[PDB]
């Protein structure tokens, strides 16, 4: 008799041959859409039932460590590569191609390649400091027969 899905319908609308044609984020989430979502969450918001459900919520919030333990979780050094940390001679092009300054900077870049506590950006900054230092000391170097830049 009172069949839920058998009988006449309004028929104002038609079958959705095309579905969800406009994207859900038509614009950046507005205050109206941001607030309705918060209310939907409260609809199913019930208190913790055991220590598992509490730890699940802490994990979703980042409060509790993820397992298995990864000692480098969230620790990506600018998405670098091993070759960037190890091969640093590209940055010594401005320096003299030979001579005492080249011999010294070779030692500097050798240590920087073996430094696990510095990022590529910090390693480059050590190189740049010496470039500007010797430039300021152009006159003292020239007396010693060393030509810089």
């Amino acid at each position: 008799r009172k069949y839920l899905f058998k009988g006449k319908r309004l028929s104002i609308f038609a079958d959705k041959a095309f579905a969800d044609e406009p994207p859900e984020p038509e614009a950046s989430p507005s205050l109206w859409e941001i607030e309705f979502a918060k209310q939907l969450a409260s609809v199913a918001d019930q208190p913790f039932e055991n220590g598992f459900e509490e730890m699940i919520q802490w994990t979703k919030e980042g409060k509790l460590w993820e397992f298995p333990v990864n000692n480098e979780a969230g620790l990506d050094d600018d998405g670098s590569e091993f070759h960037e940390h190890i091969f640093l001679d590209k940055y010594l092009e401005d320096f003299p191609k030979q001579g005492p300054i080249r011999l010294f900077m070779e030692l500097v870049t050798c240590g920087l390649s073996k430094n696990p506590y510095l990022s590529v950006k910090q390693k480059v900054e050590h190189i740049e400091w010496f470039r500007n230092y010797f430039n300021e000391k152009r006159d003292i170097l020239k007396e010693n027969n060393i030509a810089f830049t």
């Binding site: 839920l4 609308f13 609809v43």
Partner: protein, 152 residues
């Protein structure tokens, strides 16, 4: 003043939703049914028609959508208790074993309302189906808040 005019007006808004190529969502139908709870006597045939259109469009009825149909077919202040409607039995068969998620602001209301209808009809078998639905998956999260959890 006139329901027939009022209903024809609300339908006109729906007709302009298709002229402008705007497709309705769950909230659109949920809003219409919540309004129909005022006219219990005359909203029964309109209310069922909406749910059939919901499936044809492809919108999936949520717990809130049934919460409104129950109110409209099982009034709390119902003098005519001699021959109550049987729709509650059909809905429970439809929702048997399904899992539901928060998709509206009246999802919590459904379970408290379903238990009330079971007590009114003095059918304990139906109460087990309603409670059994609450236990499937994580439906327990939609029982209700502090006021409605103790009533259920």
């Amino acid at each position: 003043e006139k329901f027939e005019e009022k209903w024809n007006d609300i339908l006109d808004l729906l007709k302009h939703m298709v002229a402008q190529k705007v497709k309705p969502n769950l909230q659109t139908f949920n809003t219409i049914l919540k309004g129909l709870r005022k006219c219990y006597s005359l909203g029964r045939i309109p209310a069922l028609q909406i749910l059939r259109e919901m499936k044809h469009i492809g919108i999936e009825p949520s717990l809130a959508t049934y919460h409104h149909i129950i109110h409209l077919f099982y009034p709390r202040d119902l003098s005519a208790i001699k021959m109550p409607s049987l729709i509650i039995y059909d809905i429970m068969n439809e929702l048997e074993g399904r899992t539901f998620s928060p998709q509206d602001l009246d999802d919590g209301r459904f379970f408290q309302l379903a238990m009330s209808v079971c007590s009114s009809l003095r059918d304990l078998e139906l109460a087990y189906q309603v409670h059994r639905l609450l236990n499937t998956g994580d439906n327990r999260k939609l029982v209700g808040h502090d006021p409605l959890r103790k009533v259920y």
